[PDB]
Ligand SMILES: *[C@@H]1O[C@H](CO)[C@@H](O[C@@H]2O[C@H](CO)[C@@H](O[C@H]3O[C@H](CO)[C@@H](O[C@@H]4O[C@H](CO)[C@@H](O[C@@H]5O[C@H](CO)[C@@H](OC6O[C@H](CO)[C@@H](O)[C@H](O)[C@@H]6O)[C@H](O)[C@@H]5O)[C@H](O)[C@@H]4O)[C@H](O)[C@@H]3O)[C@H](O)[C@H]2NC(C)=O)[C@H](O)[C@H]1NC(C)=O
Ligand SMILES: *[C@@H]1O[C@H](CO)[C@@H](O[C@@H]2O[C@H](CO)[C@@H](O[C@H]3O[C@H](CO[C@@H]4O[C@H](CO)[C@@H](O)[C@H](O)[C@@H]4O)[C@@H](O[C@@H]4O[C@H](CO)[C@@H](O)[C@H](O)[C@@H]4O)[C@H](O)[C@@H]3O)[C@H](O)[C@H]2NC(C)=O)[C@H](O)[C@H]1NC(C)=O
Ligand SMILES: *[C@@H]1O[C@H](CO)[C@@H](O[C@@H]2O[C@H](CO)[C@@H](O)[C@H](O)[C@H]2NC(C)=O)[C@H](O)[C@H]1NC(C)=O
Ligand SMILES: O=C(O)Cc1ccccc1Nc1c(Cl)cccc1Cl
Ligand SMILES: [Fe+3]
Ligand SMILES: [Zn+2]
């Protein structure tokens with residue numbers, strides 16, 4: 001049989017991947033790139049097999065021919081008799097979060113404020129909110145909407161990167177990988193928590209997972225849910241308990257992608273790997289946990305219960321949903337067809 005070559009984005013993911021590789025007895029090995037797009041390119045070249053992707057990245061990967069293989073499944077809201085691997089996924093809720101103390105800030109007063117985004121091209125952090133903003137403003141100048149932002153992946157000298165902080169050494173400012181302090185769900189939420197930005201574009205889970213003791217991180221350990229509010233599209237503000245009635249969109253879950261000709265093998269290997277290292281896997285937590293990384297969401301989101309089988313052998317467009325695909329396409333007209341590589 002063949003090894004599966006995972007692609008890790010940045011050095012922290014690479015360290016975790018290397019641990020996984022060792023524990024997997026080399027059934028999984030690691031390639032690494034500086035950005036998700038570069039990992040997608042390694043896979044396109046056949047120099048890596050697979051990685052787990054946010055839905056926007058799935059769009060990029062899908063235009064280039066890669067296919068969804070298995071999806072992140074978090075704990076469900078409702079009892080299900082089904083095994084996690086066979087439980088239909090529920091998408092996650094993309095939200096716009098602000099501080100309660102920032103009174104009078106609403107969806108309709110976002111112009112000229114400071115924003116924190118997971119990364120350019122990601123679902124909750126970018127495609128959904130910027131797509132909505134472009135539409136409502138009738139303008140493609142989304143790079144001039146917020147006074148300053150951290151939007152990892154943007155031009156580092158631009159306003160879209162002005163709030164990004166890079167690493168310990170201040171290096172890698174605005175890179176779209178975990179070195180950047182404010183990268184990803186957790187980074188963008190931290191950007192809001194520290195009042196670097198006025199608004200964070202993340203998902204509902206992020207708020208809950210980093211407040212009220214759920215995170216022991218120095219920056220998060222003392223945060224309280226009641227100190228945050230969600231911005232609803234109708235211009236109201238709601239407590240973070242009201243995400244189901246105050247979100248920007250329902251996002252398709254992050255999912256593993258690969259070339260078609262490697263998909264069945266990547267799938268088989270991952271199903272076995274999670275049986276070993278997944279949530280209440282045979283050798284997790286004793287040996288290694290594939291879905292933990294000290295609330296850093298490395299390789300997979302830390303709230304992943306399992307990678308689940310897809311229904312109906314879906315194309316990337318079916319997986320993302322026609323709604324979301326068209327929204328991405330419309331936004332991309334600002335900055336239809338074909339691989340971006
Ligand atoms: C924003 O993001 C947040 C972070 O992810 C989300 O919060 C997380 O949400 C999950 C669940 O959705 C939450 O859940 C965990 O909770 C427990 C462990 O704490 C887990 O175990 C349970 O699973 C069972 C199945 O769903 C449930 O068991 C019961 O339900 C029945 C029926 O109601 C009851 O039985 C009865 O009692 C009533 C009384 O009259 C009677 O009707 C009946 O006759 C019946 O006999 C029992 O009371 C019992 O509750 C139980 O609900 C629970 O789900 C669960 O699966 C998860 O592990 C996480 O704790 C939570 N995380 C944090 C940090 O808070 C938000 O949900 C999300 N918001 C939105 C809107 O999406
Ligand atoms: C920014 O603004 C943009 C411009 O409006 C937004 O893009 C547009 O988004 C719309 C919503 O996605 C498109 O509308 C489409 O809606 C139709 C119906 O879709 C279905 O849902 C029903 C009900 O569940 C189902 O039956 C079905 O399975 C679909 O899921 C589309 O389809 C039609 O199909 C039916 C039969 O199924 C048929 O009767 C019709 O003839 C028709 O073919 C329809 O074709 C639409 O695409 C808009 O087209 C789209 N506009 C543009 C210009 O592209 C964008 O979302 C905004 N961005 C954000 C972030 O909000
Ligand atoms: C690495 O992968 C190999 C191949 O799938 C695994 O070995 C297989 O294990 C299953 C269960 O033991 C057996 O049915 C097969 O016969 C084995 N195949 C071969 C050729 O060895 C192995 O368990 C995996 N190891 C880890 C740690 O992931
Ligand atoms: O119309 C479509 O193409 C897809 C569609 C419509 C309504 C509800 C869900 C979905 N698709 C969908 C699928 Cl099939 C998987 C994961 C996430 C999503 Cl949003
Ligand atoms: Fe996402
Ligand atoms: Zn909704």
Ligand SMILES: [Zn+2]
Pocket residue numbers: 312313314315318
């Ligand atoms: Zn299909």
